[PDB]
Each structure stands twice: as C-alpha cells, then as structure tokens.
Design a protein around this ligand. Structure first.
Ligand SMILES: [Mg+2]
Ligand SMILES: [Zn+2]
Lengths: 330, 113, 63, 104, 38, 176, 126, 59
RNA sequence: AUCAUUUUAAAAAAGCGUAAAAGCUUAAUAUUAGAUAAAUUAAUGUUAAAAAUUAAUUGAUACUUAAAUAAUCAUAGAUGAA
C-alpha cells in the first residue's frame, strides 16, 4: 500500500561471448596475459604501514690488548653520520688517553654491506664528485650513481679522508680501515650483524584463509550460488550496505570542522613526498626474445644478433586477404 | 669530555654542577684522575651530580649488548650463505579457482592461530 | 532553541497528579513561548506548534 | 515574464500591490533622509599605552583610534578591533551618527 | 617553444603544467602559444 | 565529495565479509577461473547495488591515489574473459601491407624493412586499409599499436598516412 | 582578432551513449520518488537529444505500471542484447557505465563484421 | 666494562593528524523544508548604498 | 538610441566568427542527482493575533576587493668545483 523495497525481482543479466567461443584456433596467451597491477598503490591507498624495525647500526668491541674494534653496517645509517664518528673513533677522541702527537693508534675499523647504502633524499642521483688530473681540460665529475653500483668503496674511503685532519698522520690511520660489500667480514673472533631479509606479510588484512571462519561474518552476497571454498561463515546480511549515504542514520557532512581536518590531511600527503626513498634504476636489456610485447625487425642485423629467422614468416607462403565474420556465436 | 661520557653525562653539565658544588678541584687533576686514578674519578663525579640534584641517563639508542644477541640482531660466529631472494609478498590475493583447496590448506593450517 | 526542548523534554517525563500544577504550566507556557523571529528562516513546517501540543497532550487529562 | 501572459491577463488587477507598496518606501526614505534614527550604538575598547605599538597590534588585528576634542577638552587615543571600525561605516548613517566608546 | 621568464596565457585554452622544477604552458589549439620558464 | 564508482562485470560474482570485531572489512571476487580479494580501511565506507554491479566509495582519508586505484581495479576485472580492441587505418598511394600469421609487413616509402611481429596478440585483417588488434591488456596494446603509427603518421597538411580509427587529428592548409 | 589556421578535429573520439539502441521502455510507479524522476530525465535524452547519434528505428516510450516492483529502464541493442535496470536505488551515473559496458563491446562485434560505426572527423572540433 | 657496545639505526615516526572526523545524525532525511523570509520586510530595510562609489563609476 | 515583447530565463549584446549572411561561447536559467547554510549579543513585567518583529557580529561555500609569507626559476665567461 506504500513504497516497500522489493526482495526478489532481479532479472537475468546478459552473458557475453567468451574469447574461446569467438576466436578459437589462435594464441591462448592473448586472453591470459592479464592487465598490469601496480602494488605500490595499494599499500598507500588501503593503508599498510610497515612496522618500524630498529636493527643495529654500529658497535664497539674491546680486547685484552689495547686494540679496539669499531664496526658499522652502512645499510642502516646514512653515509655522513657513519663517516663522522669514524673520524672521531679512528683518532681516539673518545679514548681519554688521546695525544694527537701519537705515532701509534690502537683503534681499528671495519665496515660491511657497502653495496646497499642509505642516502636520505634525492642525493644519490644529483650529487657528484669532482677532481682534476693535472692536464688542461680535465675537471672530471662523477656521479654517486657510478660509485653506489660499480665501486662504492672509494666513496666511503673518500669522505673519511675529508673529515680527518689534513696532516701526515692520516695515511697511518687509513691503513687501518677495511670495507666489505657482503654481509660478512673475514676476521675471526668478532661478531657479525644479522641481516634483515624478512618482509611483512600483510595477509591478515585482505584474506579470509588466514583467519578462522568462526570469527568472520558475511554481510552481503550477490548470487544464490554460494562458493564451497567459503563454508562455515554465518550470513547476517545488513540492511545497511545497500543504503546510499543519505538514507543511513549517520551521514558524513562537510562542515567547517571536517574541512578544517581535510586541509590537515592534505598537508600530510605533501609532507610525506619528502620522506620517500629513491632508487638507482638498473640498466636495461631489449632482447625481443624475452619480452611479452611486440616489436620490430626494422633491419637485418636485428635478426642475426637475436636469431629471429624463426618468427619471421618465409616469403614462400600465401597470404591472408580478408577475415570478416558475419555471425557471432552464442 | 670522553671519560665522563662513559658515565652518560657530557662535559658541560658536569662542571656546571662542579661550581655549584662545594668542591674546588681543577680540570688538571680530573684529567690525571680519569687516566691514572679512575676509581676516585667516579667518586668525585657522584657528589657533583648529587649536590646539583642532577640525574644521568644513557642515550636512548643504546642496547645492553647481551639483549642485542637475544633479539637476533647479531651473532658472534660466521654467517650463512643467503637464500635466493623470495618474491615480494603481494598486497593483494590472487589465484585460480582450480587450486583453492590446495591453497586453503597452506594458509589455514600454518597460521590457523 | 536547543535548551527549551530540554525543558519540555523533561516535562514530558514527569507526570502531573494535581490541578494547580497544570494551571501553573499553561499560564507560564503562554507568555514564555519561543518566538518565530528568533527561529531560523529554514526549518520544519509549523515546528512551533509541535512544541505546544507535547504539553497540551500531556495536560489534557488533568485539566 | 515569470508567469505566462494568458494567466497574467486574469491577474492584471493584482499588480496594485506592486505600485501601492513603492509609494511607501520611497516616500518614507525621501522624508527620512533628514532625521537621525533614535538608536544607541556602543563600541567596547581599551586605553592606549606606550607599550602597544602599531605593528604589534596589527598582527593581533586591532587598530589605533584618535580623537581631536574641542574647546578646553583633552584629546583621547584608544585601541580597538578592525571589524568594529568597518561595521561603523556599514551603517547608512556613518557621516554623522553618534558612536560611543566604552572603555570601562 | 620560447623561453619567457614571465609566462603568459594568450588564449583561454592555454594551461600550465609542472614536471618537477620544470614549468611551461601548452595550448590545445595554437601550438605556438607554448612556452618555458628559464 | 567525489564518490568514486567501482564497476563489476556480469560474469563476476562477489561477496563481502567482516569480523565479529568489525575492525576488518574485505571483499571477495570469484569467477569460474579466477578469484581475487581486497580490503577497505576503517575510514572507507561502501555502498553496493546488484541493480548495476557498481560499488560506491567515500574516503575520510582524502587520498587522491584512489582515482588510479579504480582504473586498475576496473580494467583488471574486465581483463577476465574479455578483450580490449583497437583499429588502424591508412590513406595513400604507394602504401600497402601484407599479413601472415600475426606478422604484418609494411611498405610505406622506406628503404629499410618494417616488419611488425606480435607476441601474444591477435591481428585480423578486414580490408587493405584496415586492421584490428586484440589483447587482454590495454597497456601492451598501445605499445603494440603505436609502433605501427610511428612509421608514418598523419601529415598536418593532408590526412595521408596512418592513424588510429578514433583520435584527435590535426589539419593545416597548404597550396590553396 | 586573429584567425585560427590549425584545425583540431574531435569527431572520431565522440562516443555518445544511446547510439546503439533500437528501442526503450520507461516504467513508472507513482509510489517511487527517487525512481520516477531518474526515468523522467532519461526519456528526454532519448528524444530531446539529437537523431544523428541515434539509430533510425529508435522509438522510446513511457508507461505507468503500478504493478511493477520498481520503476524500470528496459532497453534493446542492435546485435541482440537486452536488459532491464530498476531505478528505486540507483543514480544516472551508475547507469551510464553499464551502457558503456555494452557500447564498448558492440564495436568489438560490429567492427569484426566490417561495419564502420564511427563518425567523420569534421563533425565536432574543439 | 662498557666497550662491548651496540647502538641502533633511526626510527621515523610521522604522525597522522589528531583532529578526527565528526559524524552526524540524519535528521532532515524524510523532511521537506521551506523558507520563512518576508520579502516585504527585506525590501523596506534601508541598507547602506555606496553612493561615493556610485558617483565615480558614472563619468 | 538602449525601447519592448514571448519565455521558467535569455544583453538593440561582454567576445570569437562572415565579402555581407550563416554558424560558435559567455551573462541570465531550467529538469535530475549529489550537496554548503552553523554558532551568538542587546531590548518594553503579562497579553495583539485565522497574521506580522528591529539594530548587529563571527564562521562554511561561490562571485569580488585585493595584499602578505615560504619555496622554485629569472644565462654566463675564458689555466681547474672556485
Ligand atoms: Mg535582442
Ligand atoms: Zn593557446
């Protein structure tokens, strides 16, 4: 007698032809290479923040001799802060028996994991290292991009030499420094930093198979066809999901209060673009034999270098004139 | 300035109390003590903290190194060869229906609770 | 407006069991109406009346 | 206009209210240009000090005030908010209207 | 393109685009309106 | 507020799940072949219609990335049991092609060879001046379709050369 | 002022919504309030709109059906497709993406048959 | 006995904002509202007219 | 010169366009959906009424007046970062 929402009214919904029904006798991989899906959106969008992990950065060890050892993992602190304290420990500035007129130093340094280095910001790409080689012209600049990949070990050994006091005692000190790319040192009788290889599975947030079925609830379902892969969960269907945001009890309402909050969230996302990790992208191969994309055989040398006489069709073979089809099956 | 940071105060707040305090001692001797007579240095360091009502504390990015081993941050011996880099755990769930029962068991059983 | 309702919402809770009480509400509620010019320009229809009959329906028995 | 002509012909007589009204306002104003309205206006404010300099006030969005006095009277200088000042303009009567200042 | 320090919009269709520190104007009608700031 | 819209095709059937705790909310798509899930924060509210297979989203978090989240989500589902398509043309005198098993041979007044070779596409000729490509991913298609375009494109003076069948074309007078 | 000489053509990318239709049937309950007016507007866009971008045999109607559960928008396309969309809960925007989900495919069906269902470039400039 | 010693890397704690959303009951859901302005009074009210500006504009 | 009518609204037009015509867009505007309009101060003690309340602020949105702060760019010389 008045407007009551119906319950069981939905018509059939037209089913479209599948690519097998429409294009048999052709490459299956067409309808099986699915669309790309960038993961990095999701963790930002649907709110995954990695737990703050706080691993070790450096370490100081003594022996019954006078000799002390200073150990560093360059993947955990920045480069400069690692290099300041080296020059502060390599001398003995923490050792209260410090005379700068000493011909002898019982302080030794070790470094490890020099491949991966922390550089806060957009500095691994822009900053450079310059020098001159006696001859005219000269003035060779080089990028961190060269060191951080090919030989990153001059860099750590080059920045130390700039913080140390400019004198003759330097070489004796820098003779007592050692760097490694791997996660080890070869010395024996000393410890080694454990690497952090794990990566947080965020699976508990977007997967029922991780949780137990009795803790969960179904609030909505489309079909009368119920999956067998989902069995044991209740069905307490809300009357509330399908209601748009006007027909509900609580409405989010733009207002001087929430708009004031809106602007706080807006600065947050601008205030975070600054705290973003940039990476040296690697060089690239363009072998057509590897990619899933199409390509061109513009020239002849692209054949020999890649052995593409196969996928090229011979010239001694007929052609295809017109491939229209009138009737589309169902 | 380096013998006093083992006791987790810096130089400035040390002598700040030393002049507040009743003690007359010079910077000369306090050097000679910390090298040659170190026990008496920590003695002198204590009342100076106390007559000024000063309270030391360590820097909060320090660990009792035994605790560092226990948390598997660090090992004394040699390391192992690292495994092949595992594929990145995706933020989304995906697969084919035909293998769900095989996939259910792995996720259910291992992390049931 | 927000606190007149608190008053009348209270009076709708406390029943009256005498006759001098009901007189003591009409003679007071008469002079002490909430004028329509203080009300907003946009509002539920005739909402001034709905403030009344909450009382008058609450009084009609006793009087 | 806003109603069709065919309906307006039926209601052409109605428009006397239009013209009978404009008698009332424009005659009222035309004779009330002369007279001050009898309505008291007040402006809470504060005294002057040598401390409160201009630029100090002007981040706080206050304003200085100055009064010139007459025969035998001393001058007075005060502090006030800007939005008071513009509201005092925003009356019809601003050229002559009497405004008070309550310090205390 | 032509490097105008003081950029300027000639037609309504002109519009601004920022690629990093780079700034410029482009038009969907007249490709001569486009500029750069340097 | 912008209330973004999530389309769902008709072949797909879905479900929506929550805890008793109500602190977790996620959603499950399931087809004959595939299955796919994704969650929603406590700050994303949701509305569903079986009438349209569309879902509506509000975001108290005010993240502007969601507008990209849509196009991936929408196209990733229509990428199941449906193609994307595109069509290419040309107009000219000394122009032609030849087609042999997803290996298209182009002759547009150039000294060098101009073979086009499709890895995991479909290519079917409808006329001399027309050819359609078909593939399930839209992003590989354009990289596949545009290589054909770069050989010759529309002259701004005459519409002679190749072009897509839907595009903004430019023209400029010449030799009145 | 100055005369344009670059002509930017946008006729081929023009993709209206009701173009692949053969017919339509509005359905109205006088008890809806949200599902009436949505169907009011569609019936205008079926006739108030332009006939170039429609078929030749396009006939839209309107009927008051008290017996229905909800007001509906039934539709019929060229190559066989047919559907209904009730309107007591939906919007005008949720409907259009359904129409695109059909109109995008009919091109993939008719182009394979050889039909040019596209427009000249000179129809609409910027 | 202080030089077995270990220190840590650096933990960045960026804070989401603290002011939170205000949700509100839906009161005018199934209600139709109307205006109660009296245009008669609105017309008679003699408001300021920027005559000084209205003179310069003439020329 | 700036009138007048039909319209729910539409300038003897604020502009592009034409050999002159035609044709295109804004101002003004409608249908539908979504959707901002929230907080207050001062007065004649109580009797008019199928009825009607003044002076005034702050704030959300759009138009409008506009200024200020912060960062970025605004070409560089000649033995080699300089
Ligand atoms: Mg005219
Ligand atoms: Zn332009």
């Amino acid at each position: 007698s008045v407007w009551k929402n119906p319950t069981n009214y939905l018509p059939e919904k037209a089913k479209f032809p599948s690519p097998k029904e429409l294009f048999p006798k052709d490459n299956e991989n067409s309808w099986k290479t699915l669309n790309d899906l960038t993961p990095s959106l999701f963790k930002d969008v649907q709110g995954f923040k990695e737990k703050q992990v706080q691993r070790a950065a450096y370490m100081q060890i003594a022996k019954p001799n006078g000799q002390m050892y200073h150990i560093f993992d360059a993947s955990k602190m920045p480069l400069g802060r690692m290099c300041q304290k080296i020059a502060f420990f390599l001398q003995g500035k923490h050792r209260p028996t410090f005379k700068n007129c000493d011909q002898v130093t019982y302080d030794n340094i070790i470094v490890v994991n020099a491949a991966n280095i922390m550089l806060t910001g957009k500095k691994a790409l822009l900053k450079t290292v310059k020098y001159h080689t006696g001859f005219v012209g000269g003035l060779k600049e080089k990028s961190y991009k060269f060191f951080l990949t090919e030989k990153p070990e001059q860099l750590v050994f080059y920045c130390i030499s700039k913080m140390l006091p400019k004198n003759l005692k330097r070489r004796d000190l820098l003779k007592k420094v050692e760097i490694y790319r791997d996660f080890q040192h070869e010395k024996q009788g000393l410890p080694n930093f454990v690497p952090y290889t794990e990566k947080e599975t965020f699976d508990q947030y977007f997967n029922p198979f991780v949780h137990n079925f009795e803790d969960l609830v179904i609030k909505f379902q489309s079909s009368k066809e119920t999956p067998k892969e989902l069995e044991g969960i209740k069905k307490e269907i809300d009357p509330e999901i399908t209601l748009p945001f006007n027909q509900r009890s609580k409405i989010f309402k733009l207002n001087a209060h929430n708009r004031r909050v809106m602007k706080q969230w807006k600065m947050y996302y601008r205030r975070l673009r600054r705290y973003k990790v940039h990476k040296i992208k690697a060089p690239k191969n363009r072998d057509p034999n590897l990619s899933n994309k199409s390509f061109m055989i513009t020239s002849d040398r692209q054949i020999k270098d890649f052995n593409l006489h196969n996928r090229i069709v011979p010239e001694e073979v007929p052609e295809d004139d017109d491939e229209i089809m009138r009737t589309i099956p169902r | 300035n380096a013998a006093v940071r083992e006791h987790n105060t810096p130089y400035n707040r040390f002598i700040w109390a030393l002049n507040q305090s009743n003690i007359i001692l010079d910077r000369k001797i306090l050097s000679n003590l910390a090298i040659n007579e170190p026990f008496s240095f920590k003695a002198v360091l204590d009342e100076v903290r106390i007559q000024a009502q000063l309270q030391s504390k360590p820097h909060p990015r320090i660990i009792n190194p035994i605790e560092a081993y226990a948390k598997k941050l660090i090992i004394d011996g040699a390391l192992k060869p690292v495994q092949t880099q595992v594929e990145e755990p995706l933020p989304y769930l995906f697969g084919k229906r035909q293998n769900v029962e095989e996939i259910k068991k792995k996720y259910q059983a291992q992390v049931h609770n | 407006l927000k606190y007149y309702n608190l008053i009348l919402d209270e009076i709708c809770r406390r029943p009256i069991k005498t006759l001098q009480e009901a007189i003591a509400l009409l003679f007071v509620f008469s002079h002490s109406l909430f004028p329509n010019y203080k009300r907003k320009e946009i509002r539920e229809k005739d909402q001034d009346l709905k403030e009344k009959h909450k009382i008058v329906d609450h009084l009609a028995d006793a009087l | 206009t806003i109603v069709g002509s065919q309906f307006d012909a039926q209601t052409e007589h109605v428009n006397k209210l239009a013209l009978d009204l404009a008698n009332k306002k424009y005659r009222k104003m035309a004779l009330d240009q002369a007279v001050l309205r009898k309505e008291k206006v007040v402006v809470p404010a504060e005294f002057r000090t040598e401390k409160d300099s201009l630029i100090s006030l002007k981040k706080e969005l206050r304003s200085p005030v100055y009064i010139k006095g007459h025969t035998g009277i001393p001058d007075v200088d005060l502090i006030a908010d800007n939005r008071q000042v513009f509201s005092i303009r925003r009356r019809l009567q601003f050229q002559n209207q009497s405004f008070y200042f309550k310090v205390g | 393109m032509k490097i105008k320090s003081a950029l300027k919009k000639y037609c309504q269709h002109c519009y601004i685009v920022k690629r990093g520190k780079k700034v410029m104007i482009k038009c969907k009608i007249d490709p001569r309106h486009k500029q750069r700031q340097g | 507020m912008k209330r973004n819209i999530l389309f769902i095709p008709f072949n797909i059937s879905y479900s929506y799940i929550e805890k008793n705790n109500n602190t977790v909310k996620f959603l499950y798509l399931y087809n004959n072949d595939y299955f796919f899930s994704i969650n929603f924060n406590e700050k994303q509210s949701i509305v569903i219609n079986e009438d349209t297979n569309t879902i509506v989203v509000e975001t108290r978090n005010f993240n502007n990335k969601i507008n990209l989240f849509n196009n991936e989500f929408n196209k990733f589902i229509y990428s199941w049991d449906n193609f994307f398509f595109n069509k290419i043309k040309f107009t000219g005198k000394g122009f032609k092609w030849k087609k042999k098993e997803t290996n298209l041979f182009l002759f547009f007044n150039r000294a060098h060879k101009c073979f086009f070779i499709g890895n995991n596409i479909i290519l079917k000729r409808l006329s001399k001046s027309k050819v359609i490509l078909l593939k399930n991913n839209y992003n590989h298609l354009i990289h596949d379709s545009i290589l054909v375009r770069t050989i010759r494109s529309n002259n701004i003076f005459t519409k002679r050369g190749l072009r897509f069948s839907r595009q903004i074309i430019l023209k400029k007078k010449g030799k009145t | 002022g100055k005369k344009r000489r670059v002509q930017v053509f946008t006729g081929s990318m023009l993709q209206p919504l009701y173009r692949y239709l053969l017919s339509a049937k509005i359905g109205v309950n006088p008890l809806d309030l949200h599902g009436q007016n949505i169907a009011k507007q569609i019936f205008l866009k079926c006739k108030q709109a332009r006939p170039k971008y429609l078929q030749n045999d396009f006939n839209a109607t309107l009927v008051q059906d008290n017996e229905a559960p909800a007001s509906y928008f039934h539709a019929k396309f060229v190559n066989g497709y047919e559907q209904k969309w009730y309107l007591h809960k939906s919007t005008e925007e949720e409907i259009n993406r359904n129409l695109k989900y059909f109109n995008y495919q009919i091109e993939m069906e008719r182009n394979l048959q050889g039909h040019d269902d596209e427009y000249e470039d000179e129809e609409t400039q910027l | 006995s202080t030089y077995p010693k270990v220190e840590l890397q650096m933990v960045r704690e960026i804070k989401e904002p603290q002011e939170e959303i205000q949700l509100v009951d839906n009161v005018n859901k199934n209600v139709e509202l109307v205006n109660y302005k009296d245009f008669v009074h609105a017309f008679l009210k003699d408001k300021k007219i920027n005559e000084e500006f209205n003179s310069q504009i003439v020329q």
